[PDB]
Ligand binder design. Structure first.
Ligand SMILES: N[C@@H](Cc1cc(I)c(Oc2ccc(O)c(I)c2)c(I)c1)C(=O)O
Length: 267
C-alpha cells in the first residue's frame, strides 16, 4: 500500500506529497541562506524607526507618468539601498545551484531579480496597525513617502502585496524559496547555462510545492495563490525597471549610488 507500518502511521493525516530527503536539504540550505542575509531577523518590529513624517510630502521633480519625485526622500532611500542590494547578492551566493553558474550568468540573474527580492523582503514586513512597510528591517515608511521618493505607483503595488500576504502567514522557508524561484529565472537575455538554470528553477518549485503541502496552511488553494504572488512580484520588478530608466533620464548620476545604477541601469 504503502511503505512500512511506521511510515504509514506517520503519514496518516498527510495526503499530498511531502518534500523528499533531497528536497529537505535544498530547503534547509535556502532557508538558512535567507535568514543569514535578511536584516534584523526577528528584531525588526522593535528596532525600526519611522522615516520622519516631514520627509516625502514634496514631490517636485517631473516624471513621464506624472508621479513626481521628492529628492530628499529619494536620497533617504538610496542612502540605505546599497547594503540591501548587497544582501540579495549574499543570499544568492549561498545557493550552490547559483554559485556554480558562470560569473556572467550570476550577474544577469541578480540584475533580473534584485527588485523582486527586495520588494518581497519589504512586503513580508508590512505592519497592518501602522500601515507601513519596513525597509531593511530598520526604516518604517508610509505609502505616501515611498510613492514620492521615486517609486511612484510601484510603492502602491508593494503595499498591496504586503497587505495581501499577511493572511498567508509565510515562514522563513517560504520566503527563501519564493526568493530562489525569482532568482533562478531564464526570462533574461544573454544567459549561457539556460538548461541548468531551468532545471534548478524546476527543483526549487517542486521542493516549494511539497513544503507548502507539509505546512498545511489554513487558507485554501494556497499553492496557486502563492504562484500568483510570484507573478505580482515580477510585475513589480518590470514596473520598477521602466521607472528606473525614467529616473536616470531626469536626474544626474551623482544622486544614484554606484551599485544601484549597476544592478538596474539595464534595458
Ligand atoms: N526592505 C528590503 C530592502 C529594500 C530597500 C529599499 I531603499 C527599498 O526601496 C526602494 C527600492 C528601489 C528603489 O528604486 C527605491 I527609490 C526604493 C525596498 I521596496 C526594499 C530588505 O529588507 O532587504
Amino acid at each position: 500500500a504503502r511503505g512500512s507500518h511506521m511510515e504509514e502511521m506517520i503519514r496518516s493525516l498527510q495526503q499530498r506529497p511531502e518534500p523528499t530527503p533531497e528536497e529537505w536539504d535544498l530547503i534547509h540550505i535556502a532557508t538558512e541562506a535567507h535568514r543569514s542575509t535578511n536584516a534584523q531577523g526577528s528584531h525588526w518590529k522593535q528596532r525600526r524607526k519611522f522615516l520622519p513624517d516631514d520627509i516625502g510630502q514634496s514631490p517636485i521633480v517631473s516624471m513621464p507618468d506624472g508621479d513626481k519625485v521628492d529628492l530628499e526622500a529619494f536620497s533617504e532611500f538610496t542612502k540605505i539601498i546599497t547594503p540591501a542590494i548587497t544582501r540579495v547578492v549574499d543570499f544568492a551566493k549561498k545557493l550552490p545551484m547559483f554559485s556554480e553558474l558562470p560569473c556572467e550568468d550570476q550577474i544577469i540573474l541578480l540584475k533580473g531579480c534584485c527588485m523582486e527580492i527586495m520588494s518581497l523582503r519589504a512586503a513580508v514586513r508590512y505592519d497592518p496597525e501602522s500601515d507601513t512597510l519596513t525597509l531593511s528591517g530598520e526604516m518604517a515608511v508610509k505609502r505616501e513617502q515611498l510613492k514620492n521618493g521615486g517609486l511612484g505607483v510601484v510603492s502602491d503595488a508593494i503595499f498591496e502585496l504586503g497587505k495581501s500576504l499577511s493572511a498567508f502567514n509565510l515562514d522563513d522557508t517560504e520566503v527563501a524559496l519564493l526568493q530562489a524561484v525569482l532568482l533562478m529565472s531564464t526570462d533574461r537575455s544573454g544567459l549561457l547555462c539556460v538548461d541548468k538554470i531551468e532545471k534548478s528553477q524546476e527543483a526549487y518549485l517542486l521542493a516549494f510545492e511539497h513544503y507548502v503541502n507539509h505546512r498545511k496552511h489554513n487558507i485554501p488553494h494556497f499553492w496557486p495563490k502563492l504562484l500568483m504572488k510570484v507573478t505580482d512580484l515580477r510585475m513589480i520588478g518590470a514596473c520598477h525597471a521602466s521607472r528606473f530608466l525614467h529616473c536616470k533620464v531626469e536626474c544626474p548620476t551623482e544622486l544614484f549610488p554606484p551599485l544601484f545604477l549597476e544592478v538596474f541601469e539595464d534595458q
